[PDB]
Amino acid sequence: FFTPQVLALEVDCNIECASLLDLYGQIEVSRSTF
Amino acid sequence: DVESFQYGDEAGKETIPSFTKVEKNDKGRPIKNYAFMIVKPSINGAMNFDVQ
After folding, report:
1. For residues B20 and B2, what is the distance between their CA atoms, to the nearest angstrom?
2. B9 and chain A: CB distance < 8 Å anywhere?
3. How far is Cα B16 from Cα B32, in angstroms, rounded to an integer?
4. Which H, E and C letters describe B1-50, residue by residue?
5. Cβ of B9 and A28 within 8 Å?
6. Which of A11, A22, A26, B33 is deepest in the core (most CB within 10 A)?
7. Which domain of life is it from (chain B) (predicted)?
8. B8 contacts in A (CB within 8 Å)?
9. In chain B, how long is the greatest CA-to-CA distance?
10. Residue A28: Cβ within 10 Å count
């Protein structure tokens, strides 16, 4: 009989670490074994 | 639809916006750079999601 007020927050509490992927040299590649 | 174009892997990352979503003038003309991406149609539609 009592409908709770569904509030609109969503706690996450989950860290990533650190993308160290912009320092490295990137090269678009093609069919494998370059 | 498409909104922006990526040109390059690492150094070139200029996400040039499409003509669809771009800062337009009061008349409708854009003000910033954009790209076109003209496409040749095919079977089963898929205006941009089809095979060449």
Report:
1. 8
2. yes
3. 9
4. CCCEECCCCCCCCCCEEECCCCCECCCCCECCCCECCCCCCCCCCCCCCC
5. yes
6. A26
7. Viruses
8. 28
9. 38
10. 7
Question: For A21, phi and psi rounded to 5 degrees?
Answer: -110, 0
CA distance A19 to chain B (A): 14
Length reported for chain B: 52
Side-chain-side CA neighbours of B42 within 13 Å: the count stands at 10
Which residue in this structure is represented by tokens 């670490």?
Answer: A17
- Which residues of chain A does B9 touch, with a Cβ-Cβ cutoff of 8 Å? 26-28
Name residue B29's amino acid: R
